[PDB]
Amino acid sequence: GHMHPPNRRGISFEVGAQLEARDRLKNWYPAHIEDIDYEEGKVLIHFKRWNHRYDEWFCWDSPYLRPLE
Template identity: 35%
Template sequence: CANSSRGRDRPHPIIIEEFSWASYLKLTKAQAAPEELFASPGKVIDLQACGFEVGMKLEAVDRMNPSLICVATVTDIVGSRFLVHFDNWDDTYDYWCVQPLAPYIHPIGWCQERDLPLTPPQDYPDPGRFSWERYLDETGSTAAPVDVFKVVRNPPPQHCFRKI
């Protein structure tokens, strides 16, 4: 958070004016995770330069139920990470991905091309007739460009963090 100039949530039940990780770790007798666990392999990717923007739509695997591929939105970008949110789902299912080659995300139309079922947003009227074209129009959204989804034969290990 200090490196990205973004706010942070305090671990509960810490109620102090200025949160300090050093104090929190001492109080809880815990250790900080090593910084190298959070480093992306190779060069850090500028997601916005790659074409990703907040609000863009994509198809994403529900990591809690991998048989579901759902309508999703990029809702935040921090450095080389982006937050995937399933449309009209609770944000407890959101997860962070490090790179656009993450195996959990796909461009719109990916399921249709492979004859796989796509789960529309919860409470979507007539889910059996979901159409990306109509949905993008209804929501005033744009699809993430197909070329931002990288296909890599032997991808490096992916670090996707689940929002808690």
């Protein structure tokens, strides 16, 4: 019952792909897609250099994801 990833300009939904995301404190940082959950339509975000215990799942339609550019 996979759902289909959206088509978003400047974002590739692949493991290892780069983008920017806003953390819980509402700051944007560069990030990489660690995993993609086709089941629930989410992506595990790893912020560069962070301890991986701080990785966060984001709905892939999330406004708090955006391209590197």
